[model samples]
Structures are given as structure tokens and as C-alpha cells.
Target: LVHVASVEKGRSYEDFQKVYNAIALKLREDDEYDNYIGYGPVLVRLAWHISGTWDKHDNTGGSYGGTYRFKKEFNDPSNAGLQNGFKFLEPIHKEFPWISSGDLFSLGGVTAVQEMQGPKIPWRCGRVDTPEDTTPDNGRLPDADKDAGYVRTFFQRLNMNDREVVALMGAHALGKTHLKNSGYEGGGANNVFTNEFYLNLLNEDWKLEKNDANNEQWDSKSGYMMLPTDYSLIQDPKYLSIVKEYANDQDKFFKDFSKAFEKLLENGITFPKDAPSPFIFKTLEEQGL
Candidate 1:
């Protein structure tokens, strides 16, 4: 669907800025979750899951709907363990009730990234809510068990190129997979926002093993793991080229990731060229951390 921005009425930059501050504040205060890595990782995951629903063909299930409030979308098996992020944002949503789910969900990602010292992600608003009937079905999210070719092909549905797909996957830098959540165990550099994921991919001593859940995964002694999808970058020459580029250059990765992620979150929704320009928010310290 060629959708236009459904920006909230009677709201402007400051209004959304307050919401960003609220998310950042809680991100700091909610420091005990995820084994002390804090809520940042899962918050990023929440943002991805919400936006990941976009099909680029029908425009049915993107974050524009915000139907995750309903049970069907919330209980999507791939979304397991993300409820923590929804719960974290619940009070923020209450405070900024005027904000749409798509906006808040996406902004949460922006806030999480910057608060954790990631590259600045310029963000825009305007995702009007749809009813539960608009929510996409399960199985739209990517499979962790897949290969490089599978990863490349699956992302094309989202209209991502080799560069965009490889850039977006850098978000794996943020969170680890839980066995209960996805039959995949841990990954990431202790939930700190770093280029360590790609580094670990090229640098780790990995062994493939079947976990208790009977799923195949590449395990490392340093307590990290990579999905087959994660390894595809190195296996496929095109993806590997980009992966090596990103791994060797954190600056490039962060810059490309910011733009790619902004695109990912905005899929299936439209913004007029004259729409309000994307907002670059100040960090908590700028607002006095």
C-alpha cells in the first residue's frame, strides 16, 4: 500500500522529543533487565519485530498498524521474549498517549540505539493505527536456522539490497537470542551496542552443535552464537564483501546502519517529500543524564 504519513494532529517536534526523553530515562532506570545488559537490546528487537511485518507487496503488517497491542500479533511465536519491550514502553505510551504505536515502536529503536552509543538514527513520525484485523500473520519474520542465500532472498521481500540487508543485520550487534525465545542461544557483546557482532563473526572460534532444543547453531566458548543466517555473510561472496567492510569499519557500519534501519522501520508506509524532516534527538546527557 502506498501510504502517507499519518502524523499525529496537534503535535510537533517537541512533543516527540519529550517521548524520546521518556524512553531514554526509562532505558537508564530499567537497568536490571536482561541480566543487567538492560532493556536496550530487547527494545531494539521490539522495534525490528514491529517493523519486520512489512511485506513490501501488500503493505499489510508493518509497524503502521500497531496491532501488536492485540493478542494475535503479540503472541506470534517469533515475538517471544519481546513482551519485555512492550511492557517497558507501556508506561511511556500511557504518558504520550497521542503518539501512534508505529511511531513509538520505531522511536524506541532510535532511542535505544543512541542511548547505548550507537550511530544517530534520524527518525520521522506518522503511522496511524489500524485494527487488529490488519495485523499480519505469523511466520513472516525471518528464520534463524536458514543459510546465507535464504537470508539474502528473504530480505528482498522487504526491498533491501545486499548493502541494506548486510547493514541491517548489524543490529544483531545489539541482542542475544534466548533458547526459549527462538531455539537459539546467545549472541552479542553482552548487550552493549558495538560492532562486536561482525567482529565475532569473523573472529570467533565457532563449532556447530545441536542444543537441548534440538536446533542447530554455531556455538563459541566465549558465550556467543551465530545463526546460520548470521554466517551467510561470510559464506556468500556479495554479503561477505559487505560484512568484511562493516566489520573492519565501525564508522561505516554505524552510518550505513542508521540509514538502512530508518528505511527498514518506514517500509510499507509513505512520507511525502515535504513531510516534516526527520528529527535528530539529543542524548540524555544533553538533556542532563
Candidate 2:
């Protein structure tokens, strides 16, 4: 078991809570993306990408460093459109200059998930900034053009199980795939983040339509989209059952997603049970009440 450290000295619960507020405030301010849809989904993607870098055997990568702010990592192809997420956080970083980059980036994801009514991901501190050379290579993130077998194989490198992979992809329910960003066009419609991803998977008679850009959109009457990989959940027999389960039951979807998402965020290091459970910070909008 790889031991992980807690928040650094001088940065206790209050300090981190302030950082959470800063992130929440910025999220409220930057509510315009992919046609004014808001920053929630991209922030979740950013958190996933950061944490996804962890290699369980070595403990080399993970959300510990918050290193995505650096140029090298920012330019990663798999991270194609994530620059928007980084740019969105710039003002907050300026406002709270003391927090570590890793903490702030990871916290943005935690804030997005919680404020959007997802899960309370327990987070830790101690990620000190490193040089640009430390950034992992591109292709670390999963591909939309791939099949279920490919998706399963890819996530294994990150130590994700089948159930976890299905739950993570459920996030596709939240954000759209940009033609300019991922070369795949349209998954979800703007601003309506919910368990609709699974519902669409089951209900929509998705006919494959090629966009003008020559990429495919899983076109349906609902105006939502699914990638080849996203659709593969139903194409494969084993994955189909889990997909159908989420489609039929919203409460089960939420519970599974919460557990899987928490697992994704905690990929690399092991924490003692005595360590405080991750704090569930309320959004700024909620805090005002």
C-alpha cells in the first residue's frame, strides 16, 4: 500500500475550504462554454485526466501534482480542449496564489462533481509543483473512436475495473464532444447534465450520421450524441447489463457513479481509514443560503 500525505502544514481544513470557495466562485463566473453550457463538465474531465495519470504499480503520476497548468501537459493531444478548463481557473489561481496547483485543479473537479449533485470525492494535499518535463505524454486519456474491448484495455493501465469504466463514461452524459476538440461531434446537449446518458443509450434509436466534418454523431430524435466507444456499452453483452441497469434506475445510477468516481479520484495512493473522509464542500450559491 502506497502511503499518501495529508494537507501541508499551515494549510488546514479552513484554508482548503477557502480554496474550495474560490473554485466555486470561479465556476459560477465562467458559465459559458460549448455555447454557454457552463464549465461543470469540462472541470470534471480535467479532474479525471489529472487523476487518471496514476500508474498503480509505481505511484509516479496522479492528481497529486496538479501539473496540468504547465505548458507541456496542457498541450497534450488527449487534453486537446482542456485548455478551456485551465484558462477558466487562471483568475482563481491569481486570487488564491498560495494553494498548490495540484490541489486547486483536483479541487475544481471535486467541486464540479458535488455542486452538480454527483459525489463527494475525498481529496488530499501535498502536491508540490514540478517542472514542465514532468508532464506525462499524450494518449494517456481514453479514445472515443475505440471499441469496448479497447476501452476496457485502456482503463486497465489506470487500474479501473469494468464497473468503474462504465460509471466514468457515464460522465459523457454531462458534456458534449466537440468536433474541434475530440474530432467526435455532439454527445449531450448543452447545460442539461443528468443521468440522461444512460437513458439515451436505451431509449434512442441512434442512427449513425456523419457530420459535415466527416466525424460520426450517433444521431437521434433526442439531439444527444454517443461515440462508438460510448455506444459500445450496449453493443457488448456484459457491458449491456450495466448500461441497462443505469437506464432503468436513476437512483442506482447515482450510487454507482458516486462510488466509481470516488475510486477514479483515489487511483494511485492508499489512505488510512483514520484519515478524514473528503469534505463535502457546498457550492457558493448554496453557501449564501
Candidate 3:
């Protein structure tokens, strides 16, 4: 049997701890974007997008490369608004010049999720830089204009199942779809980083209106927007059950989210049973100085 090598290398738990601290500190300082929605949501989104490119069948693209720092990848139209997440980390990268861009970017996602009171994602540190030729082509990221079946089929290629898909999209509850960013208007205004994505789905009177500019995503009177794919969760029978369950119980949402997000981060990699479980780093508020 041909065994696949682990994607894990440079930094140990201690090294990552410092990287975590750097991200946490920067997140503290850069709390002024998107009407103070802060960089947390976008950072998480960045991590997700980076990791989401992985294909379990061939394992072509993933967070292991950290290629987003490159011009070609950065200029990806799908990555239009992610510059905010990257800019938020630039100062931290300068401060900690030793950390790999791949590591820094992935760690940013882990830190943001933990600080936002999400789950502790077990992270490894082996991603070395690859040449420009290794950068994956753009358009791998999901479109905001698709429906439930499309979303479901898209994630399956990434090795995500139905439950995992539901939990991940629940993240849409955190940040609004910027008109300039996604060409869609507000989805959630408060950006409290809760499982409210499910709630908004359950309770809101979401009108099937189109944005003035991008008539693609669906909008609602509650000042929230849902991508056609996001709204399709409820329209689909299996996805709707999970959505309703999360809407009624935040604890369940958090539990499932922790597992799903961790899995999302770890996509395209394998770990030994003895491997350390994910670390649940505390947020600035949780640490309380």
C-alpha cells in the first residue's frame, strides 16, 4: 500500500502559539473595518476560501500553499473583497517576519474563529512555499448566485457532507455580503458572530428581491441578504432540518460548528490518532488581559 505523507512541518505547537498571539493582537488593533464588523469574519472567510479549494480526489489546491500573497491569486475576481482580510494581516506579517505566509494566513482563520467564540481547530504547520506555477487557477471558490443543489454538489467535491455544508454556510451569519464585495447587499447587519445565520433563515421574511446593482443574491426586509445558495438551505429538505435545529439551539450550533469548521480547515490532510486535538484559544474578551 502506498501511504500518503502528512501535510504537517515547520512550526511546533509553541511556534503556532506565538502565531496565534500575533493574529490575536492584530485583530485587537484592527477593529475598525466594515462598520466595526472588524476583520474577524472576513479572516474566517479567507481561511475557508483558501482551504476550500482542495479536491480530495487529486488534492491540487489548498491552504498548504499560501499562494494568495501572489499577485495572480490575489487578483482573482472571486477573491475581490478578501483584500481586507489580507491587509489586516500585513502588519502582523511584518512584525513576525519569520512565519510562512501559508502558515500566517491559515492561522489567521484559526485565531479569528476561536476569538469569535467558535471552536478550537487543531492546526498543523508544515506548509512550505511553492513556486508561482503551483498556484491553483481561480474560479474554484463557490459562486453566490447558485442554488442548494449546486452548493451541495460543489462542497461534495471538497469532501464536505450535508451536515458540514449546513454548518459552514451558517458562517454567513457573521458578515454581510457587501454590495461592492459580493455585489449583494446586507445579509446580517449586526455581525455578532453567532449562529444567527440559521435564525435569519427561520424567522426573517426574506423577500426574493434583487440588488440594484447585482440582481443575483436574494434580499430581505430585515436588512439581510442571502445568496441564492444560502436561501436554498431551507428550500432543500435535508438542509432545512439542520438549519431549523441550529436556529433553535445555539449550543448545538456551536458544537456542530466547531467540528465542521475544524474539518473545513483540515481538509486535504490526514492526521495520526495520536495527533494533538485542536487547541481552543481564547478571544481577547475571553482572556480578559
Candidate 4:
């Protein structure tokens, strides 16, 4: 039950940084995905979904195992739209076959956020791929139909508190949902990462409506939408306060999200006391690439 991070044989920071750059360059190259919302949102979702399978109690099914490469986990109904992310990473994996599936998948998210003008997430390497038999059963990811209570209780299993949950959910600001994939529809999609999810929740004139899939979602006159779980943030008083906090302060949201996201990706792994420090990669724009 103990998963220790064993660095890929001779690799180090510069090596992983190259992998990061590959993913970033491809992200820039793949400019027209998902109606130009790009791969950022789906990459973020893929990272979250891969890490979300962890059960703190049993220490099974987390980013540590790299189990999402297996067919069963990849085909999880909860993971419907994430195939795009896997496909997006295929070439990067081909170039750097040494990086573990967990590392590549999770790092794709970090690269996406930074490349999309979001925060710089400090990332660690070294997730050994586990066997297909080690893949956790499906049905572990959250349901969009639930409310605040469910969100709060559900994230507990992932060991996330209200602040972390709220900060992580800020990713919703990035991409629009496809009804064909998740039974939810999105409008006015955006690829940049920001606190707009909170701003929209707090300010939008939202109406509860059903989509073609017969699922409930919150729609706004400004051509925005929120899942039931997303709208639940404003429905509950406690979550509402945090939502408003993020909506008002972009810096706080970015910093909090960076930390929460790093924590989310790091869950279920034991890093040795002497492991190299987490690498904070520069965005392509910063590198003049």
C-alpha cells in the first residue's frame, strides 16, 4: 500500500523540463481543438480524473500508479471526453518514452495551465506505471448532478477541503462541456485559465435549465453554463463565501489553485526526503519560444 516515488533511472529536472516543453509546444501547435478552446481544459480534466481515483483510506488508485493508460480506466464513463487528452499526449510520449504515464498525464495539465496564461504549477516527476490489473474500478469520479453536500463529501475521499475544492473547480472556467461526452452543455467556451468560473457563478443571471440530454445545468444569458455541482457552490453559504473570494481576487485564486493543483497531482505518492525540489517550468512565451 506504500507507493514510493522512484525517479526514472537516470532522469532529472532538465529531462522532465524537456518533456514539459514538448507538451507545451504541441499545445500551441494544436490550436483548433474543441472549437478553439484548445486542449487546455481537457488536459486539465484528464489530470484531475487520473488523480481523482485515489481512496485515501486504502491508498489505491491515484496518480502514483499511472493506471489510466489501461483500457478499463481510459474507457471509464466518467472519463468520456478525456480521450482527446490521451491522444494529444501520444506524440509527446513517443518522444520521451521514459516518462511514466502518470507523470506525462499529470504534467500535461501543469503545462496546459501555464501555457494558457494561468499560474505556474510546480511539478514533481517519478510515477511508476502499475499493471492493468491495478486499475481501480470505474464510478469513482464525481457526478455532475449532485449538490454542495455531495461535492463536499465526495472530495473528502480525495482529502480535499472546501478551499482546495473551490480552487480546483476554478478550472471549469477554461473549457466548455460537450453534451455528447458528459451529458452537460457549455457555451462561450474559453481556453485561458482564470477565476471566471467564480465570477460567472456570482454575477451571471443563471436559470436552471435542461439540455438536449435531459440533464439539469445552470445557463446564463451571457452564453455560459454551470453544472449542478458547480452551481452548488453559490447555493451553500460557506462555499458561496469562498466563491466570492476567488471572484474578487485573481491573485489569490491563482496562488491557491497552483498549490491545490500540485497537491492534487501529488496525492498517493511518497517522495523521499532527498528528492529534487518540484520543478516550476517557464511558459513558452516567457522562454521566447
Best by TM-score: 4
Q: What residue pairs are clashing in model 1?
A: none
Candidate 2, 193-284: lDDT as tens digits: 46777888888888988886877657787677788888889888888888887788777777777777766776665566665656666666
Error of 3 at 186 (Å): 2.1
- Candidate 2 wrong stretches, greater than 4 Å: 1-3, 270-275
Question: Tens digits of per-residue lDDT for model 3 on 1-289?
Answer: 1112243454456666766887887776777888887788899889888888777778777776778888888888888888989988898888877776776788888888777777666666545566788778888889877788899999998888888899888888776776776677775465456888898888888778767774776666766777888889999999999999999888888888878777776666555566565555555666574
Clashing pairs for model 3 are 9-126, 122-278, 186-225, 187-224, 187-225
Error of 3 at 288 (Å): 3.5
For model 4, the stretches where C-alpha displacement exceeds 4 angstroms are: none
Cα shift from native, residue 206, model 1 (Å) = 1.2
- Model 2 TM-score, 2 decimals: 0.90
Cα shift from native, residue 263, model 3 (Å):
1.8
lDDT of 3: 0.77
Clashing pairs in 4: none
Write down the lDDT that model 4 would get.
0.93
List the global CA lDDT of all models: 0.87, 0.75, 0.77, 0.93
On a 0 to 100 scale, what is the lDDT of residue 155 in model 4? 97
Worst 10 residues of 1 by lDDT: 185-194
Give the TM-score (vs. native) of candidate 3: 0.90
